[PDB]
Design a protein around this nucleic acid. Sequence first.
RNA 1: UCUAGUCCGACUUUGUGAAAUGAC
RNA 2: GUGAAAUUCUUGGAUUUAUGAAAGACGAACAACUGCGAAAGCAUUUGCCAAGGAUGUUUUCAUUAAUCAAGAACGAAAGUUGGGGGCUCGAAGACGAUCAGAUACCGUCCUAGUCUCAACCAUAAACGAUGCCGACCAGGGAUCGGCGGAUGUUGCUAGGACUCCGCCGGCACCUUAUGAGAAAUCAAAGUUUUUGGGUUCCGGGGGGAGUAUGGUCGCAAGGCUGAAACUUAAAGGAAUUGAC
Lengths: 215, 98, 95, 132, 25, 200, 91
Amino acid sequence: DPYAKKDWYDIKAPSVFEVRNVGKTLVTRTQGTKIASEGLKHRVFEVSLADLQNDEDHSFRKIRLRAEDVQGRNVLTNFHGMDFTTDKLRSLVKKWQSLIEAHVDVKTTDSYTLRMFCIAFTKKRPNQQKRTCYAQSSQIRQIRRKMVEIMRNQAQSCDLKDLVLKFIPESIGREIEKATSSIFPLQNVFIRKVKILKAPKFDLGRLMEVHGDYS
Amino acid sequence: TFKRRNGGRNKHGRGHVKFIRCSNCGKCCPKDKAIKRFLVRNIVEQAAVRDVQEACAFELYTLPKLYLKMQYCVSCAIHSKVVRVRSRTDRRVREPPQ
Amino acid sequence: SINNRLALVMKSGKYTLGYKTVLKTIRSSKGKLVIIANNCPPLRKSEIEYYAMLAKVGVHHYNGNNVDLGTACGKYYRVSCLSIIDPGDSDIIKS
Amino acid sequence: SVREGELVFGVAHIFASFNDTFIHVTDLSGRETMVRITGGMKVKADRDESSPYAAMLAAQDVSQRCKELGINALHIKLRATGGNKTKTPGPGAQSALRALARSGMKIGRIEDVTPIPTXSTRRKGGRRGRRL
Amino acid sequence: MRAKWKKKRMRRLKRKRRKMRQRSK
Amino acid sequence: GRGAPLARVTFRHPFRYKHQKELFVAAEGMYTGQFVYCGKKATLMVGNVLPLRSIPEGAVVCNVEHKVGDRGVFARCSGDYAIVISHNPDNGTTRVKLPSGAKKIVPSGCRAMIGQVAGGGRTEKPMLKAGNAYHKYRVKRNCWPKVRGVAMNPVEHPHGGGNHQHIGHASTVRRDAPPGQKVGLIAARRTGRLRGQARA
Amino acid sequence: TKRTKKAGIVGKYGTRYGASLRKQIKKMEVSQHSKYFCEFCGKYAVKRKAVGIWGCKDCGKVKAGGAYTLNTASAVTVRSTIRRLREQTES
RNA sequence: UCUAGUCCGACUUUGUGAAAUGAC
RNA sequence: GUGAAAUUCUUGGAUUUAUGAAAGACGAACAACUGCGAAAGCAUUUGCCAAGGAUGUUUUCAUUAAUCAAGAACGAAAGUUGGGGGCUCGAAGACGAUCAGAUACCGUCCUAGUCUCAACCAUAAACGAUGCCGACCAGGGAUCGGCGGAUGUUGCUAGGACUCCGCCGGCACCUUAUGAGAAAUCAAAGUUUUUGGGUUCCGGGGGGAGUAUGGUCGCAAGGCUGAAACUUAAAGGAAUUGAC
Ligand SMILES: [K+]
Ligand SMILES: [K+]
Ligand SMILES: [K+]
Ligand SMILES: [K+]
Ligand SMILES: [K+]
Ligand SMILES: [K+]
Ligand SMILES: [Mg+2]
Ligand SMILES: [Mg+2]
Ligand SMILES: [Mg+2]
Ligand SMILES: [Mg+2]
Ligand SMILES: [Mg+2]
Ligand SMILES: [Mg+2]
Ligand SMILES: [Mg+2]
Ligand SMILES: [Mg+2]
Ligand SMILES: [Mg+2]
Ligand SMILES: [Mg+2]
Ligand SMILES: [Mg+2]
Ligand SMILES: [Mg+2]
Ligand SMILES: [Mg+2]
Ligand SMILES: [Mg+2]
Ligand SMILES: [Mg+2]
Ligand SMILES: [Mg+2]
Ligand SMILES: [Mg+2]
Ligand SMILES: [Mg+2]
Ligand SMILES: [Mg+2]
Ligand SMILES: [Mg+2]
Ligand SMILES: [Mg+2]
Ligand SMILES: [Zn+2]
Ligand SMILES: [Zn+2]
């Protein structure tokens, strides 16, 4: 009975990703004191990057999408952070190696305040004989310092749309690995998580920039 | 009578080690003394892999694994048969079994 | 800090400790560097700087109150400001 | 408004404790419950609420209700009690997941979402633990 | 008797003597 | 009669050729000869008076206005202060925590002095003497000493009378009791030693 | 010589008011009657005029402080808290 | 057997709109 | 929630799901027969402040040293006084079970406490049950810090990472008896009737007893110091065979 008065809506992803048919979501039909659009606004959808990018190699990454506007039957969402799956992180953390983590708060050109989390692990050499590949605490601090510096530069210059485009190929991770190789070889350098602390007030003009005419 | 050279734990050149809580009963035990086992297994049991795979909604998909690190106290490890009482000669063998 | 360099002057150079003598050295142009404590009276601090600017004498702000400055000079009394007449050993150069 | 062949993905939150089993189906946002059946609703004794048989019956009811709403695909988010308590899923996790696969529902991406503290608050029972 | 509890018993017994002796000073 | 010290401040009158004298509740750290800045654009420093709109969250303030322009009603006693909790730009209001621990909504235009009231820790020192209490209340009002009702006769107090000193009925009285009957614990939600979450 | 073993300044109360109250009041009795360092002139010449008011004998600076001490513990915390907030806003 | 006060409802002060819902 | 149950919560919407916020605590995985510290103890990032071992040294002083009555600093947890804080957990208390009884173990709620500041307390299986300094006396690999030498690779900026040889210092481990020991066992617990490098503390069958008393320290809780009368032929250590 209660489900007989619910209208299904389609979820649309930004133009950054390939597949825009994220899925479907329902909500109670519009009624006095309860507008349907209000109920759907700011709803957070968690969908794997593999579905958005149609690539199974990205199954380890999850994308947070929040609804911004409801144009007709389509719900327009936007990037709202990303994080690893539980299995992915647990697979990277192994004994007999050093774990290095870093975080930084940066502001993009679109007034978006982000908190990027980086992660890396020490890498053995092909001819290495000792079982461990630990790094000295001084080396860890040097590596962590370069992680923060690189993350600031990549985010302080580009906008949110361009910054997200760097996460899909993990361009930032490769740059961090290249820069820190002179200190200690690293493996599995990723941007583990991204948080949206403060977002600029809604602007329909900018929302439609990354969304096409779904009519 | 002293039963073990290590005193039943693994502590050298340090005074105090913070304890952990037994995964079974919650008993406090020093981390260096607790019996630790890292269990990695498929999130889907082998008896259900065939059914789940047939119902998969994707052409290709790898079932994620379940990583769980178990820390037991001495009493729970013995009772659960994680470890067994060994003869005086076999107590010194530190290499994991086959 | 400049305590190590200042200590050399106290045993090899020429100096005057106190507000009244510092003005005297600036008037006669015998002062080459003026050091002022951070808790010096604001009006007194401005007057000394104006005198030093008029006489083309460098002014350095000591990192501490009048108590610390006197101790660094090897003395048992507070010093709000002082003037260096003879650098002694590489005191005015690196300042 | 779904054409033949298209998959309408839902999210099934499976909470497999050692005292009861929950099979909660929601939307992708998790803010719209579709059906919620617990193992305690299918048995008479408190001891059988977490049994695999109870989990199987709950899964069958959930699968039937999902078809009525047009839901044919489910994302699996399994979890244990978590927190400072046991991290091991209960005995009803495997039975519930297998039952859904054998009811026409197409299983999507499976994930473990047990709440894992990065430290934690003190566990109950005292420093000597639960003594049996 | 466990030594810890025997120690506890003696400490209790010393309070009574301490209080029973200070009763007359 | 006031524990907190007071500060005399001189201002230049905005449009009259004369000095403007003021008397502020002294904030901890204030000193003679200090410059005090009041206004929307005054910097965040102890002693300055700013509107709540310009004070960031977590700041310690005192003498907070309840109504814009009422000149300060909140957190005026020695050692007391208010904490800015959050701002609401839509409603133009601010949340502050009062000394009693209550949260209140006030318009963002309300002014407040940065810092806490000076003279804190006064009540920690024991009086030790009736005379010290006498001198304290000699300059406040005629409220000391206090005679217990159970020591009076029935004619002048509900607790009076009886061959033993005792109340004889529940000391908790309802809110609507008329004057002369409303004595003791007025509208007490509970009684007894405050143990557990009650004393939070 | 040592006139009192432990009573110190609270010896003026004789045998009255109980030991705990005398011990409790000793802390504030000593602090409110002691000289404090003057940040302005650099002398130990700050004494309490009245509760919460502290004036320097030498330079004449009058400062609003604690009831029985020049600087209360919360006073230091407030200054650091205000300073931290100012830097963020003035960034 | 009553009463000041106090709490509570209606009318009055008391006008201008809108929406939802309901009645005639 | 439990072996099973019950106390307990619930259509006044419990449990469950998503988002957001506050509060207080904690700092998982990495994490090791690894590190630092006089010990207690120390594990999220970055900055500041002082301190420190080892290594390197063709620098300097030139016996300034070792161990220590008295006397001092620090000293887990619990506890004590007051203020703050009060999530979680939780003595006492209450209740639900179990039971012949159950003031317990299990379950539910919960006070002090658990966190912090100021001031005390000075005790732990505070254990390596092994005081500190010095010399000598087997072998072997691994590991941590520093340095020397050799060598050719790195999606790297001489150096780092890795490989090989060696030196000093550290936490340990493995084999072995030519040793020691009542043995367990120990590369020190060896160099001891073939007895002696230096120095401090400390023990003299088992109980009574860390009790009484006096002194001293502490707000208290107690700490430190510390007997006798009397009682007893064993108590105890290591190992062996049985029985359980
Ligand atoms: K062990
Ligand atoms: K009176
Ligand atoms: K009275
Ligand atoms: K009476
Ligand atoms: K001490
Ligand atoms: K070595
Ligand atoms: Mg290295
Ligand atoms: Mg034994
Ligand atoms: Mg060490
Ligand atoms: Mg210890
Ligand atoms: Mg058992
Ligand atoms: Mg009174
Ligand atoms: Mg009378
Ligand atoms: Mg009467
Ligand atoms: Mg003077
Ligand atoms: Mg950590
Ligand atoms: Mg380490
Ligand atoms: Mg001694
Ligand atoms: Mg302590
Ligand atoms: Mg002892
Ligand atoms: Mg000992
Ligand atoms: Mg010694
Ligand atoms: Mg020792
Ligand atoms: Mg090395
Ligand atoms: Mg051996
Ligand atoms: Mg001998
Ligand atoms: Mg004896
Ligand atoms: Zn256990
Ligand atoms: Zn002064």
